[PDB]
Amino acid sequence: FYLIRTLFRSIENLYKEIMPLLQVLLESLSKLIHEARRPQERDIYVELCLTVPVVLVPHLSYLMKPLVYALNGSQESVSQGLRTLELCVDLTAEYFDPIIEPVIDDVMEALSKHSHTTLRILGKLGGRNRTFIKPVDNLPGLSAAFSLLTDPRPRIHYRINSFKYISGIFQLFLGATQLPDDYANRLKESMDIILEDTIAPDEPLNSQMELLVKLLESIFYAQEVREESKALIRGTCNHFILLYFNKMVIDKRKFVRKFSVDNLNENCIFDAIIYALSSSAVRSMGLESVQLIYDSCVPLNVMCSKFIEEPYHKKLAGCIGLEMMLNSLNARQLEIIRALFCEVTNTAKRLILNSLKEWNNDVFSSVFQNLVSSLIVDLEIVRATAQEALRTLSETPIATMISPCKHILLAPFQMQIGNIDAITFCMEELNRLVQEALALVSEQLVRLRVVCIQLLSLAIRSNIRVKILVVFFKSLCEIIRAAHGGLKAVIPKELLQNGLRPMLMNLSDH
Amino acid sequence: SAETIHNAWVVVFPVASRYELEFTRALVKLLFKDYHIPNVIKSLLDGVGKCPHLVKYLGSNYNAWYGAIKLLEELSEGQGIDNQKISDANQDALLEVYMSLQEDDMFYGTWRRRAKYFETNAALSYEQIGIWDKALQLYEAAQIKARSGVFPFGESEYSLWEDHWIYCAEKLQHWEILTELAKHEGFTDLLLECGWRGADWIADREPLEQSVKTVMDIPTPRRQIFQTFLALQGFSQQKDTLQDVSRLCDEGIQLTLRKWNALPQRVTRAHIGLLHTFQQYVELMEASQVYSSLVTTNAQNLDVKSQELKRVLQAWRERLPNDINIWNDLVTWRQHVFGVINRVSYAYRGYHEMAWVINRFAHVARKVCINQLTKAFLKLREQAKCSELNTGLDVISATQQKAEFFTLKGMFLAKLNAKDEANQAFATAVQIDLNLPKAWAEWGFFNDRRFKENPEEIFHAKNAISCYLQAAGLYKDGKTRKLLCRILWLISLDDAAGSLAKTFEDHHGESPVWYWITFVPQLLTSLSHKEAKIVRHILIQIAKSYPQSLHFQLRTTKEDYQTTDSRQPWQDVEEIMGILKTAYPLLALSLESLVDQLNQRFKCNADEDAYRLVIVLYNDGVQQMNRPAATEASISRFADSVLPKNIREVFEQDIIACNPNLETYISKLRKWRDCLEEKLGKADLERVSLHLSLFHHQKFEDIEIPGQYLLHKDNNNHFIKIERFLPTLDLVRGSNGCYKRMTIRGNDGSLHPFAVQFPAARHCRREERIFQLFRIFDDALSRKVQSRRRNISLTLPIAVPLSPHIRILNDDKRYTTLMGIYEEFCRRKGQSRDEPFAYTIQKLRAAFDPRLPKPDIVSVRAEVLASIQSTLVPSTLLKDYYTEKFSNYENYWLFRKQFTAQYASFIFMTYIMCINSRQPQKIHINEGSGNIWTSTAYNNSTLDPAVKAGAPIFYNTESVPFRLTPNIQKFIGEAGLEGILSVYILVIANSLSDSEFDMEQYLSLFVRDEVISWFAQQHRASAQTNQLREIVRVNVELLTKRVLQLNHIPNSQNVATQFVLNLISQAVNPRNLAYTDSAWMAYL
């Protein structure tokens, strides 16, 4: 209780976030107790906190939530919510989590259900890739019969050795296998015992986002990668912004250049595609040979799946081909997406902000300030990292910059540095002071009230707003009443005596 | 280290098996390269390396996978007939090679019903379940015997044989065993060996296991499953029989299930038979071996594996079900009673309770030969385990009251009328006894309606039958319980407000809501009569203090949507607001504040964006005032990163050309007209609305999301709050109305969105009542034993309408219909805006001399219709858009199945009840999913007889509205109406016979009275008789005249294909489509 509550509630995040898997699994694997509020509050808080901020968090949270949530006693809301959230976030993956989640899920569901099976199975039933993404060291006639029997016209060409040799060799060679216990009856019986299918259905299925997200994420999430990504991003952004800014009228000065400098397939494509596809080497060989031959003589799965010897050719070929092909024929998406995702944000934001802000005049400041403030303020780590990095890196307009800190911080370590740095560094008054002070009202109330009251009262009509808002809010009305009344009233004798006597009398008489 | 290098290097590099690739690549490459003496190398290398040439490379390089059926079947079936003169090889090879596997439907129906003569297409194509299959055989035999110019078609012969076995399946196994002596290598051994095994049968079981296992090619797992189950089953007690049989294979056969991963068709299929056979055989063999090996009488076999094993195995196995699986699993898994009962209470309860599921499930789910051909201690089990013959034979061998009253009343009630006969037997037999279920609904509804239809004093006694409805107060509920609401109509035949005052108030107030909160709809329409009390206290108190959040949508939407009218809202809103506000706390503070602020926050902007305001202000001001001080107003307001290059061209041309004379007018007119016209949206709620914020989701209020909060669907579940999203709300493209598509992001499992269709409707809020007709489709869910599982249920959404003109639709992937996607997708590409009908009608109608001197013809239509109506815009748009929009088998199969099922189910289910519109603005769709969601005089007969007032007026007036598309009506699906006749004829003809329930309440309440002008309908429909025709004459005449018939002498009933052939032939032509008169002027 003290170790799980102090270690799980006191949370540099790799040791504290990863200590609960080995500590809770090894400490709880001895068949003991310590549950109720600890397993229920730890499973609900771990599932809500771990699922509210959505590769180590999914594997550690999904692989660690089953060990601490599947070792309790009863099967009420903690088993359905914890098993539905942990099983819905990740099911049959990470090898160990697949063989460790099916035994506890099937044993706990069958043992605990032998009304919970209908609500848990019907409310937690999900048709995914369970029958095709299982394997785990386990171990035909439609195309051959239809394709081989649909033709057979014109003349004759045996058409007997292929069907006889393919049918006899495929049936005789495929009809005999071998296995050695291991985990075949448990995975086959446990994974195949769930007979509750509900048809199939699920149709759904179905250019700047792929090139900007792939080029910005692959070039910014990568020497040759830093020099090619920085030179390609700086040359493409400076050449696209300078070439698309519509300038160069009739100036008499200089410094108005540096815009552009950079400028048999059947045998290689057929031999490389047929030889490489008729045998991870197909994506690197086909993408590198097709990208090098096509780019030198004249896609998102390989660069996106390989960028996270094939990384230099895939990232250089995909970034050079996508940047050259997409730029040889939008600054807020590329600059915000490329600078909002630590040296790439400071180098790209400082180089793009210093070069773009120093290379120019009201269109650049108004368009850059309005697009950067609206795009950066209009958008859990993406909002705090993008808002804190863009606001802190671009702030070196009080309603838009003061409303996002109180509204974003009050509607939900980055909140204290971002709100304290932006509010303390960013500093008609009746609407903003009465609306922000009356609408902003445990650290958010003391920090916003102390910072706004100290900065507004020390940086220099509040009787009507404080008396009407305090009298209407305090007279118009378990933690919301005590926290709002005590925090809003601890900062007119009938309203104070009659309105304050119920808190001390009711709170002290119980 | 062009077709010779790729064919020789690719075909010769693979030889350093491999017969289909070398033979198909060498024969196709040698025949195509030798007979074509450039797109195969680029399409095959680019299409095969990037992931005719794509279907052969992707369909042949997968080593015969599951995805090759779409490329091989589509490429091999895309061109067969209507080419030169070869059609027997393409039709027989395409129909025989494509009419197999598992996925067929349209392929089996079209290939088996539209190929050559097809004499067995009536019984074979109209069979399906096997109803008309009884005869089918006769027809086949007849043709065979006759011949004399027959088309052979052995396949047909074999089909006939299979049908025969099916018919004689199980029950008729007597003669089927004779097939084991001749025809039946697997059917006689599997049916005869699986339908009745023995104890000391070593030669009979060794031949099937040793002869039905040689490869064994389990794919095709009939011989392997039958040989493995028959060889592993049977309690022989041979010491190491269960250990050797369960240790040698058993689990290894489960590896064959992995082969199903190479062919997922369909979903379960083999998983239910392999998992049920392996789990039932392993559990029955382990339980029978342990119980049979642990002695018995010597310690009475103890316990353990008895109550828990028999109750858990019998309850889970008998209760966990879904035809062949129930009869094969129940008949083949009943071998445990012989081993446990022969070596001696579980055999009688398990065998008698488990053996009765095939008769009730097969007879109740197969509904004519199944129920008639599949069906003092011996009198109860023999007489209970299964007009004078039913009562004498069923009573000569409580069940007497329900069987005699239900059989005599149900079998003697039609006939036609009722009056007496079953009145004394139904009222006397249903007005006593104790517990009853079907007697209260059948005898209560038939006796109450037939007895109360005369409207006299004795009919008041029928009100006492309403007390029998109290017996249904503890019998669960269900959709059939809604039929009990029809009993409330019997109150209309009562006196004033008494009669059932103590029974209705005490019975309705002493129980729960049930049908007083989950039904609603029609219950929200009874307000002008005496509906202010009676069930108002029990419905308001139970629905407001028992159903939790249930009356917020009906009370807020009904009370906020709309001198008795001015005084009814103050008394109803004051009494409901006072009793509810004094009942809860705050009755609904979050629903009233969130619904009032969110629903009333659309009054202030209510605006457009920057392109519409800058283009409308600059174009209206410059165009209205023109017929660098003024140029700075459009640049300061149009700078929103949406003017490219309108801001650079207009600012550079206008700022650089602000002198002379011709440069200012030409540069200002060309730059202002081209820049202002070439950029002519967004919605920012944070700088206009500013309500969602502190609607902070209202600091996480205790309210459910809009759409997923009902009393029946998703009730008592994970009801959490919705966090919504930001404020960047974009409109849906740009049609006639500003569709404000909101976003409702829910981190607690409610990530979705919203929509708004501005504020306009046809019949105002009353038009929303038409949406209640869609709820009638939900009644199909109460009568779909096979259409719900075979048709993937049906399309349905969540649309919460606000106020009297707002609608909250659900958009999963934007929104697109027929006119939006067809006009927007077909009017794009090149320079097009108002062509097709405008260019063809204006050019064709204005190309000649307008006089017209004198008729002429100038015919007619005719060639002018084919040249000014059929000018492309049909097969190219549907074939190029549908064929080019798909990229794999999931897009083609999901788009074709979803488009055919959604178009056939939406057109057949929405083309009735005076809604048969052949134009647009009706059955809409989306994008990734589809769907379709967006007199004479009086002459009254007074009373007494009412079976002679059938005035059928036939006068065509106005109507029209039956044109436009058409177009790709016969080419948008698959060979016209090939696959739509099975689902449309089976789903439309499967109902309208039983399980009506909601009919007179929805038809009479929704059709009475007429809207608007309540004068002739309200003053003429207020009589004192039984039915007043209207809904009964229109529903009985349209349903009876349109659904006739279903049975005959030699299985020759209309529709069949009479509705599709008569509707398609009488609705898709030239004079029928140009002369209107589609559904006889909307019926009307």
mmCIF file with all atom_site columns, N, CA and C in Angstrom, chain A residues 140 143-144 146 149-150 162 171-172 175 188 192 197 199 201 203-204 246 269-270 273-274 378 411, chain B residues 6 10 19 45 49 64 68 93 97 215-217 254 267-268 275 648 696 726 789 792 894 928:
data_model
loop_
_atom_site.group_PDB
_atom_site.id
_atom_site.type_symbol
_atom_site.label_atom_id
_atom_site.label_alt_id
_atom_site.label_comp_id
_atom_site.label_asym_id
_atom_site.label_entity_id
_atom_site.label_seq_id
_atom_site.pdbx_PDB_ins_code
_atom_site.Cartn_x
_atom_site.Cartn_y
_atom_site.Cartn_z
_atom_site.occupancy
_atom_site.B_iso_or_equiv
_atom_site.pdbx_formal_charge
_atom_site.auth_seq_id
_atom_site.auth_comp_id
_atom_site.auth_asym_id
_atom_site.auth_atom_id
_atom_site.pdbx_PDB_model_num
ATOM 1   N N  . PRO A 1 140 ? -6.632  -21.859 -51.680 1.00 0.00 ? 140 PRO A N  1
ATOM 2   C CA . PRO A 1 140 ? -5.520  -22.589 -52.296 1.00 0.00 ? 140 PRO A CA 1
ATOM 3   C C  . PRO A 1 140 ? -5.914  -23.251 -53.613 1.00 0.00 ? 140 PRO A C  1
ATOM 4   N N  . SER A 1 143 ? -7.894  -19.969 -56.816 1.00 0.00 ? 143 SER A N  1
ATOM 5   C CA . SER A 1 143 ? -7.124  -19.287 -57.849 1.00 0.00 ? 143 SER A CA 1
ATOM 6   C C  . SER A 1 143 ? -6.503  -20.264 -58.839 1.00 0.00 ? 143 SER A C  1
ATOM 7   N N  . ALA A 1 144 ? -6.068  -21.436 -58.370 1.00 0.00 ? 144 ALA A N  1
ATOM 8   C CA . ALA A 1 144 ? -5.469  -22.417 -59.266 1.00 0.00 ? 144 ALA A CA 1
ATOM 9   C C  . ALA A 1 144 ? -6.524  -23.131 -60.103 1.00 0.00 ? 144 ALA A C  1
ATOM 10  N N  . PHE A 1 146 ? -9.736  -21.988 -60.653 1.00 0.00 ? 146 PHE A N  1
ATOM 11  C CA . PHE A 1 146 ? -10.464 -21.013 -61.456 1.00 0.00 ? 146 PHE A CA 1
ATOM 12  C C  . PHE A 1 146 ? -9.581  -20.407 -62.540 1.00 0.00 ? 146 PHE A C  1
ATOM 13  N N  . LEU A 1 149 ? -8.570  -23.484 -64.863 1.00 0.00 ? 149 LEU A N  1
ATOM 14  C CA . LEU A 1 149 ? -9.710  -24.092 -65.531 1.00 0.00 ? 149 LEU A CA 1
ATOM 15  C C  . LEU A 1 149 ? -10.546 -23.093 -66.319 1.00 0.00 ? 149 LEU A C  1
ATOM 16  N N  . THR A 1 150 ? -10.371 -21.792 -66.083 1.00 0.00 ? 150 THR A N  1
ATOM 17  C CA . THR A 1 150 ? -11.139 -20.786 -66.805 1.00 0.00 ? 150 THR A CA 1
ATOM 18  C C  . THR A 1 150 ? -10.633 -20.567 -68.225 1.00 0.00 ? 150 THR A C  1
ATOM 19  N N  . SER A 1 162 ? 0.469   -29.930 -64.132 1.00 0.00 ? 162 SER A N  1
ATOM 20  C CA . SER A 1 162 ? 0.377   -28.831 -63.176 1.00 0.00 ? 162 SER A CA 1
ATOM 21  C C  . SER A 1 162 ? -0.716  -29.080 -62.144 1.00 0.00 ? 162 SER A C  1
ATOM 22  N N  . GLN A 1 171 ? -1.341  -31.331 -51.575 1.00 0.00 ? 171 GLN A N  1
ATOM 23  C CA . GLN A 1 171 ? -2.148  -32.054 -50.597 1.00 0.00 ? 171 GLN A CA 1
ATOM 24  C C  . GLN A 1 171 ? -1.295  -33.021 -49.784 1.00 0.00 ? 171 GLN A C  1
ATOM 25  N N  . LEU A 1 172 ? -0.345  -33.697 -50.431 1.00 0.00 ? 172 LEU A N  1
ATOM 26  C CA . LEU A 1 172 ? 0.513   -34.632 -49.711 1.00 0.00 ? 172 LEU A CA 1
ATOM 27  C C  . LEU A 1 172 ? 1.560   -33.897 -48.883 1.00 0.00 ? 172 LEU A C  1
ATOM 28  N N  . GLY A 1 175 ? -0.634  -31.908 -46.100 1.00 0.00 ? 175 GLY A N  1
ATOM 29  C CA . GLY A 1 175 ? -1.433  -32.729 -45.215 1.00 0.00 ? 175 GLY A CA 1
ATOM 30  C C  . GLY A 1 175 ? -0.691  -33.367 -44.064 1.00 0.00 ? 175 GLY A C  1
ATOM 31  N N  . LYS A 1 188 ? -4.903  -22.569 -29.023 1.00 0.00 ? 188 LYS A N  1
ATOM 32  C CA . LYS A 1 188 ? -5.947  -22.956 -29.964 1.00 0.00 ? 188 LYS A CA 1
ATOM 33  C C  . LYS A 1 188 ? -7.298  -23.100 -29.274 1.00 0.00 ? 188 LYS A C  1
ATOM 34  N N  . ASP A 1 192 ? -9.749  -20.139 -29.747 1.00 0.00 ? 192 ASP A N  1
ATOM 35  C CA . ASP A 1 192 ? -10.810 -20.626 -30.618 1.00 0.00 ? 192 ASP A CA 1
ATOM 36  C C  . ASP A 1 192 ? -12.069 -21.019 -29.859 1.00 0.00 ? 192 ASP A C  1
ATOM 37  N N  . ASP A 1 197 ? -19.545 -14.853 -32.940 1.00 0.00 ? 197 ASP A N  1
ATOM 38  C CA . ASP A 1 197 ? -19.352 -14.001 -34.102 1.00 0.00 ? 197 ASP A CA 1
ATOM 39  C C  . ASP A 1 197 ? -20.629 -13.232 -34.424 1.00 0.00 ? 197 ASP A C  1
ATOM 40  N N  . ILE A 1 199 ? -21.476 -11.562 -37.807 1.00 0.00 ? 199 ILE A N  1
ATOM 41  C CA . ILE A 1 199 ? -21.279 -11.260 -39.223 1.00 0.00 ? 199 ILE A CA 1
ATOM 42  C C  . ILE A 1 199 ? -19.869 -10.730 -39.448 1.00 0.00 ? 199 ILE A C  1
ATOM 43  N N  . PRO A 1 201 ? -19.234 -7.294  -42.050 1.00 0.00 ? 201 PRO A N  1
ATOM 44  C CA . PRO A 1 201 ? -19.425 -5.879  -42.410 1.00 0.00 ? 201 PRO A CA 1
ATOM 45  C C  . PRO A 1 201 ? -18.153 -5.048  -42.319 1.00 0.00 ? 201 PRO A C  1
ATOM 46  N N  . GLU A 1 203 ? -17.237 -1.724  -43.591 1.00 0.00 ? 203 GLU A N  1
ATOM 47  C CA . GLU A 1 203 ? -16.805 -1.262  -44.902 1.00 0.00 ? 203 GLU A CA 1
ATOM 48  C C  . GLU A 1 203 ? -15.713 -0.209  -44.753 1.00 0.00 ? 203 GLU A C  1
ATOM 49  N N  . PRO A 1 204 ? -16.087 1.066   -44.521 1.00 0.00 ? 204 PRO A N  1
ATOM 50  C CA . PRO A 1 204 ? -15.091 2.140   -44.364 1.00 0.00 ? 204 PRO A CA 1
ATOM 51  C C  . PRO A 1 204 ? -14.044 2.164   -45.467 1.00 0.00 ? 204 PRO A C  1
ATOM 52  N N  . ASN A 1 246 ? 5.991   36.713  -53.750 1.00 0.00 ? 246 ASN A N  1
ATOM 53  C CA . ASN A 1 246 ? 5.721   37.724  -54.764 1.00 0.00 ? 246 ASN A CA 1
ATOM 54  C C  . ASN A 1 246 ? 6.448   39.028  -54.461 1.00 0.00 ? 246 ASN A C  1
ATOM 55  N N  . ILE A 1 269 ? 13.814  -1.682  -63.928 1.00 0.00 ? 269 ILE A N  1
ATOM 56  C CA . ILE A 1 269 ? 12.565  -1.737  -63.174 1.00 0.00 ? 269 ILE A CA 1
ATOM 57  C C  . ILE A 1 269 ? 11.929  -3.117  -63.279 1.00 0.00 ? 269 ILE A C  1
ATOM 58  N N  . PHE A 1 270 ? 11.975  -3.726  -64.466 1.00 0.00 ? 270 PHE A N  1
ATOM 59  C CA . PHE A 1 270 ? 11.391  -5.052  -64.635 1.00 0.00 ? 270 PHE A CA 1
ATOM 60  C C  . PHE A 1 270 ? 12.281  -6.130  -64.026 1.00 0.00 ? 270 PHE A C  1
ATOM 61  N N  . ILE A 1 273 ? 12.272  -5.325  -60.102 1.00 0.00 ? 273 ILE A N  1
ATOM 62  C CA . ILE A 1 273 ? 10.972  -5.575  -59.490 1.00 0.00 ? 273 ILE A CA 1
ATOM 63  C C  . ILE A 1 273 ? 10.600  -7.050  -59.593 1.00 0.00 ? 273 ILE A C  1
ATOM 64  N N  . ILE A 1 274 ? 10.922  -7.686  -60.718 1.00 0.00 ? 274 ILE A N  1
ATOM 65  C CA . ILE A 1 274 ? 10.603  -9.099  -60.888 1.00 0.00 ? 274 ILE A CA 1
ATOM 66  C C  . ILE A 1 274 ? 11.567  -9.973  -60.094 1.00 0.00 ? 274 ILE A C  1
ATOM 67  N N  . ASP A 1 378 ? -4.686  27.516  -31.485 1.00 0.00 ? 378 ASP A N  1
ATOM 68  C CA . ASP A 1 378 ? -5.906  26.777  -31.788 1.00 0.00 ? 378 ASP A CA 1
ATOM 69  C C  . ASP A 1 378 ? -5.766  25.278  -31.560 1.00 0.00 ? 378 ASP A C  1
ATOM 70  N N  . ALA A 1 411 ? -9.468  24.140  -18.424 1.00 0.00 ? 411 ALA A N  1
ATOM 71  C CA . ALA A 1 411 ? -10.427 23.262  -19.082 1.00 0.00 ? 411 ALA A CA 1
ATOM 72  C C  . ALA A 1 411 ? -9.947  21.818  -19.017 1.00 0.00 ? 411 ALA A C  1
ATOM 73  N N  . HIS B 2 6   ? 12.210  -9.194  -70.152 1.00 0.00 ? 6   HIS B N  1
ATOM 74  C CA . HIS B 2 6   ? 11.428  -9.381  -68.937 1.00 0.00 ? 6   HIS B CA 1
ATOM 75  C C  . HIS B 2 6   ? 10.790  -10.764 -68.888 1.00 0.00 ? 6   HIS B C  1
ATOM 76  N N  . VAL B 2 10  ? 12.627  -13.078 -66.434 1.00 0.00 ? 10  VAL B N  1
ATOM 77  C CA . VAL B 2 10  ? 11.747  -13.349 -65.304 1.00 0.00 ? 10  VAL B CA 1
ATOM 78  C C  . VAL B 2 10  ? 11.235  -14.784 -65.338 1.00 0.00 ? 10  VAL B C  1
ATOM 79  N N  . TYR B 2 19  ? 4.831   -24.315 -61.441 1.00 0.00 ? 19  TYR B N  1
ATOM 80  C CA . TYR B 2 19  ? 4.227   -24.735 -62.700 1.00 0.00 ? 19  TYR B CA 1
ATOM 81  C C  . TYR B 2 19  ? 3.205   -23.746 -63.235 1.00 0.00 ? 19  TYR B C  1
ATOM 82  N N  . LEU B 2 45  ? 5.262   -3.892  -63.800 1.00 0.00 ? 45  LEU B N  1
ATOM 83  C CA . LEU B 2 45  ? 6.394   -3.555  -62.945 1.00 0.00 ? 45  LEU B CA 1
ATOM 84  C C  . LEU B 2 45  ? 6.033   -2.454  -61.955 1.00 0.00 ? 45  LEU B C  1
ATOM 85  N N  . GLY B 2 49  ? 5.321   -3.756  -58.442 1.00 0.00 ? 49  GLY B N  1
ATOM 86  C CA . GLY B 2 49  ? 6.445   -3.317  -57.642 1.00 0.00 ? 49  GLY B CA 1
ATOM 87  C C  . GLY B 2 49  ? 6.097   -2.197  -56.684 1.00 0.00 ? 49  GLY B C  1
ATOM 88  N N  . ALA B 2 64  ? -1.806  -18.494 -54.953 1.00 0.00 ? 64  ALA B N  1
ATOM 89  C CA . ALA B 2 64  ? -3.201  -18.864 -54.712 1.00 0.00 ? 64  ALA B CA 1
ATOM 90  C C  . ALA B 2 64  ? -3.617  -18.514 -53.280 1.00 0.00 ? 64  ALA B C  1
ATOM 91  N N  . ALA B 2 68  ? -6.857  -13.381 -54.483 1.00 0.00 ? 68  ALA B N  1
ATOM 92  C CA . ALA B 2 68  ? -6.772  -13.620 -55.918 1.00 0.00 ? 68  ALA B CA 1
ATOM 93  C C  . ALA B 2 68  ? -8.125  -13.900 -56.558 1.00 0.00 ? 68  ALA B C  1
ATOM 94  N N  . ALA B 2 93  ? -17.626 -21.801 -68.489 1.00 0.00 ? 93  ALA B N  1
ATOM 95  C CA . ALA B 2 93  ? -16.434 -21.747 -67.647 1.00 0.00 ? 93  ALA B CA 1
ATOM 96  C C  . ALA B 2 93  ? -16.541 -20.637 -66.608 1.00 0.00 ? 93  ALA B C  1
ATOM 97  N N  . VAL B 2 97  ? -17.156 -21.948 -63.036 1.00 0.00 ? 97  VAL B N  1
ATOM 98  C CA . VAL B 2 97  ? -15.974 -21.650 -62.234 1.00 0.00 ? 97  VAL B CA 1
ATOM 99  C C  . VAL B 2 97  ? -16.222 -20.526 -61.239 1.00 0.00 ? 97  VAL B C  1
ATOM 100 N N  . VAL B 2 215 ? -4.545  -38.161 -47.775 1.00 0.00 ? 215 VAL B N  1
ATOM 101 C CA . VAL B 2 215 ? -3.721  -37.003 -48.108 1.00 0.00 ? 215 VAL B CA 1
ATOM 102 C C  . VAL B 2 215 ? -3.617  -36.018 -46.940 1.00 0.00 ? 215 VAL B C  1
ATOM 103 N N  . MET B 2 216 ? -4.737  -35.571 -46.349 1.00 0.00 ? 216 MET B N  1
ATOM 104 C CA . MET B 2 216 ? -6.122  -35.916 -46.684 1.00 0.00 ? 216 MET B CA 1
ATOM 105 C C  . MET B 2 216 ? -6.827  -34.745 -47.361 1.00 0.00 ? 216 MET B C  1
ATOM 106 N N  . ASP B 2 217 ? -6.084  -33.657 -47.567 1.00 0.00 ? 217 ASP B N  1
ATOM 107 C CA . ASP B 2 217 ? -6.586  -32.436 -48.200 1.00 0.00 ? 217 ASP B CA 1
ATOM 108 C C  . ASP B 2 217 ? -7.801  -31.893 -47.442 1.00 0.00 ? 217 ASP B C  1
ATOM 109 N N  . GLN B 2 254 ? -6.342  -29.445 -35.132 1.00 0.00 ? 254 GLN B N  1
ATOM 110 C CA . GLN B 2 254 ? -6.585  -28.015 -34.977 1.00 0.00 ? 254 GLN B CA 1
ATOM 111 C C  . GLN B 2 254 ? -5.664  -27.193 -35.868 1.00 0.00 ? 254 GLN B C  1
ATOM 112 N N  . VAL B 2 267 ? -16.076 -15.531 -42.089 1.00 0.00 ? 267 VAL B N  1
ATOM 113 C CA . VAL B 2 267 ? -15.846 -15.242 -40.678 1.00 0.00 ? 267 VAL B CA 1
ATOM 114 C C  . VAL B 2 267 ? -15.683 -16.545 -39.903 1.00 0.00 ? 267 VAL B C  1
ATOM 115 N N  . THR B 2 268 ? -16.777 -17.035 -39.323 1.00 0.00 ? 268 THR B N  1
ATOM 116 C CA . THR B 2 268 ? -16.742 -18.274 -38.555 1.00 0.00 ? 268 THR B CA 1
ATOM 117 C C  . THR B 2 268 ? -16.728 -19.483 -39.481 1.00 0.00 ? 268 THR B C  1
ATOM 118 N N  . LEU B 2 275 ? -14.552 -25.818 -33.650 1.00 0.00 ? 275 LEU B N  1
ATOM 119 C CA . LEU B 2 275 ? -14.469 -25.513 -32.228 1.00 0.00 ? 275 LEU B CA 1
ATOM 120 C C  . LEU B 2 275 ? -15.554 -26.238 -31.441 1.00 0.00 ? 275 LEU B C  1
ATOM 121 N N  . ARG B 2 648 ? -1.716  38.538  -53.875 1.00 0.00 ? 648 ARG B N  1
ATOM 122 C CA . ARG B 2 648 ? -0.497  38.957  -54.557 1.00 0.00 ? 648 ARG B CA 1
ATOM 123 C C  . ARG B 2 648 ? -0.801  39.576  -55.916 1.00 0.00 ? 648 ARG B C  1
ATOM 124 N N  . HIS B 2 696 ? -17.104 24.261  -21.050 1.00 0.00 ? 696 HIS B N  1
ATOM 125 C CA . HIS B 2 696 ? -15.757 23.719  -20.791 1.00 0.00 ? 696 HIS B CA 1
ATOM 126 C C  . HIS B 2 696 ? -15.857 22.241  -20.927 1.00 0.00 ? 696 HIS B C  1
ATOM 127 N N  . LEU B 2 726 ? -12.210 21.659  -30.679 1.00 0.00 ? 726 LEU B N  1
ATOM 128 C CA . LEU B 2 726 ? -11.777 23.050  -30.701 1.00 0.00 ? 726 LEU B CA 1
ATOM 129 C C  . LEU B 2 726 ? -12.903 23.942  -31.210 1.00 0.00 ? 726 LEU B C  1
ATOM 130 N N  . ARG B 2 789 ? -28.926 -11.411 -40.090 1.00 0.00 ? 789 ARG B N  1
ATOM 131 C CA . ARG B 2 789 ? -27.617 -12.048 -40.086 1.00 0.00 ? 789 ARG B CA 1
ATOM 132 C C  . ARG B 2 789 ? -27.045 -12.231 -41.486 1.00 0.00 ? 789 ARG B C  1
ATOM 133 N N  . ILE B 2 792 ? -26.359 -8.267  -43.043 1.00 0.00 ? 792 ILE B N  1
ATOM 134 C CA . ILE B 2 792 ? -25.540 -7.405  -42.194 1.00 0.00 ? 792 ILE B CA 1
ATOM 135 C C  . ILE B 2 792 ? -26.414 -6.358  -41.517 1.00 0.00 ? 792 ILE B C  1
ATOM 136 N N  . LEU B 2 894 ? -16.701 -4.061  -50.571 1.00 0.00 ? 894 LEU B N  1
ATOM 137 C CA . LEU B 2 894 ? -17.454 -3.246  -49.622 1.00 0.00 ? 894 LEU B CA 1
ATOM 138 C C  . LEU B 2 894 ? -18.268 -2.171  -50.331 1.00 0.00 ? 894 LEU B C  1
ATOM 139 N N  . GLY B 2 928 ? -17.503 7.092   -47.421 1.00 0.00 ? 928 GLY B N  1
ATOM 140 C CA . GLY B 2 928 ? -16.875 5.815   -47.141 1.00 0.00 ? 928 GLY B CA 1
ATOM 141 C C  . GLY B 2 928 ? -17.856 4.712   -46.807 1.00 0.00 ? 928 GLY B C  1
#
